[PDB]
Amino acid sequence: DVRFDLPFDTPVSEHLEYARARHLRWVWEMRLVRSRDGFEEYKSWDLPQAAARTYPHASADDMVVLMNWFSLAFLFDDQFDASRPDRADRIAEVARELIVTPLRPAGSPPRVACPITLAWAEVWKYLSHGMSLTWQTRFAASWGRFLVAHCEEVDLAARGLEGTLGLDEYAEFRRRTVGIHHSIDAGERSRGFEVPAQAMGHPVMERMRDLAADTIGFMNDIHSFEREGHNLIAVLRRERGCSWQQATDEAYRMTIACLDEYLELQERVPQMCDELRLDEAERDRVRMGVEAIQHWINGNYEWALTSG
Amino acid sequence: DVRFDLPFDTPVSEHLEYARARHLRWVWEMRLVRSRDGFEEYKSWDLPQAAARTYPHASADDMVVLMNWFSLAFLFDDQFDASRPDRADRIAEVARELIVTPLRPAGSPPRVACPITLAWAEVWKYLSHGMSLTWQTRFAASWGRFLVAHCEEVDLAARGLEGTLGLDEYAEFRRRTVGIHHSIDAGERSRGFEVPAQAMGHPVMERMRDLAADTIGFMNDIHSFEREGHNLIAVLRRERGCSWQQATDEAYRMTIACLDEYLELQERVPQMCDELRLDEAERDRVRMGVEAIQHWINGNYEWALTSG
Ligand SMILES: [Cl-]
Ligand SMILES: [Cl-]
Ligand SMILES: [Cl-]
Ligand SMILES: [Cl-]
Ligand SMILES: [Cl-]
Ligand SMILES: [Cl-]
Ligand SMILES: [Cl-]
Ligand SMILES: [Cl-]
């Protein structure tokens, strides 16, 4: 069992039990689960815990909105009859409704009405509340890129094409499908700040987000693999024709290499702020931005340890 | 006939005839027009001229890409059999493919393949070329908001609901449907600069884009009206129960009031740059940003004068 020793110490929200309880009633009220068995399957994933570790500064009511959101993505596949002929077309259709919801005024009804799209129209109204147009645009494209990539994964599987990606293509693709850019963006909503726009578009920060997404997608592949061809481990083994264990070792080395480059860019943040000429309150907002990334890398890891 | 005397003097591209000729062959090569009559109808709109007045600094090859893009939006309705039962559903479907194209790597094939989506997948690869992730995100959300709003207009008509918007809702809606935010964004691609991100998200610039969009949507309604219920003039008349001429006068007064507020914010740009602490090359990029807005307001007007 691959363990990582990460150099972060990261808070956990005090609102876990308060918000879990509301969140669990909400999944029923919004008809995202339909049977007792489906519900208990959903509960076993312990998504509330992930939300509490990744958004640790949220107010209690916002922790509820965050858990609700968290559930949308993970329940998304499970909204559709798995044996129907055109499953992959219905998924694309629903995903695209989720993509346009942040591109229309908050409170507008979705065109494709199903439990997930109605749930998301609700959540987006809260998640966007109080946030600038700059943040909403950034979120909207991050979320959109994620969902497009999710549709590509779904089509890859429906077409009989899992196992065809080589290492470099797989790594590029996994950066997209892991959905961490929009996850980081929401840190600003959860804690009530916005990162200065000239810092968000600086090469250091853009690269940091990409490495955070690599690191997390690769840890998640290592973790899913250890409990079972579209998986970093499998891909490495096909690519190198090595043992299952040499492929594990190499996945581990790739992950630590992403992490270490992430840590090097972290130490460069003060120089970035100097080159941008940021004042002290801007610097402070940057620092909080970097912490949202740490919450994701560390919190995701610590949640994965306790199963799901 | 309402005339406006605008306080802008605005260049026109020298590449009009060079690019028109390539652009006209392209609309056939991409199968956007299908008959000689459809083509001559397309030619009468003189979209090349609009592109030459709105993107006057484009290189010659980029002027071609801009005209090609211009054509996509205007040909879009005309790609679909107008009498089929579910026209409005097919439009939404195609619009959403156009929305996700900028949310996936350049050169990827569209999932819904038809002449317009293939054409756009091509155009986006050139339009995004050399542009930062910040610009592509901004463009992508602007274009997306436009297309969503276009689908809302299409559904409004298919449902028998034209003529139901009151004045305030109509004004809000027309800001969305006129599609000027993404039009302004492309000025940076055409001329080869990017506006500093902290200026783009400043309240002055965000408001300037909104007023430019009002001004242009209202001029375009005045101009379409004078050559014929979803029209500023008609809406004002329903709202005020006034004469067709008093409704025209009032549309004219609303437009001049948007314009004058636009002109007041224009004079505030140097103070904005001071409050942001921009250096001189950043100031210069801002100034070019403002010129892209002027090119749109002035160029659209001067193009409208010569019919279509
Ligand atoms: Cl947080
Ligand atoms: Cl998520
Ligand atoms: Cl392979
Ligand atoms: Cl802030
Ligand atoms: Cl230009
Ligand atoms: Cl356009
Ligand atoms: Cl009315
Ligand atoms: Cl520039």
Side-chain angles (χ1 to χ4, degrees), chain B residues 134-149:
Chain B
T134 293
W135 180 91
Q136 295 178 52
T137 289
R138 167 151 58 76
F139 179 93
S142 293
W143 176 244
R145 292 184 186 103
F146 159 67
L147 283 169
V148 170

Side-chain angles (χ1 to χ4, degrees), chain B residues 69-70 73-74 143 182-183:
Chain B
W69 183 42
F70 245 92
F74 285 79
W143 176 244
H182 63 79
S183 307

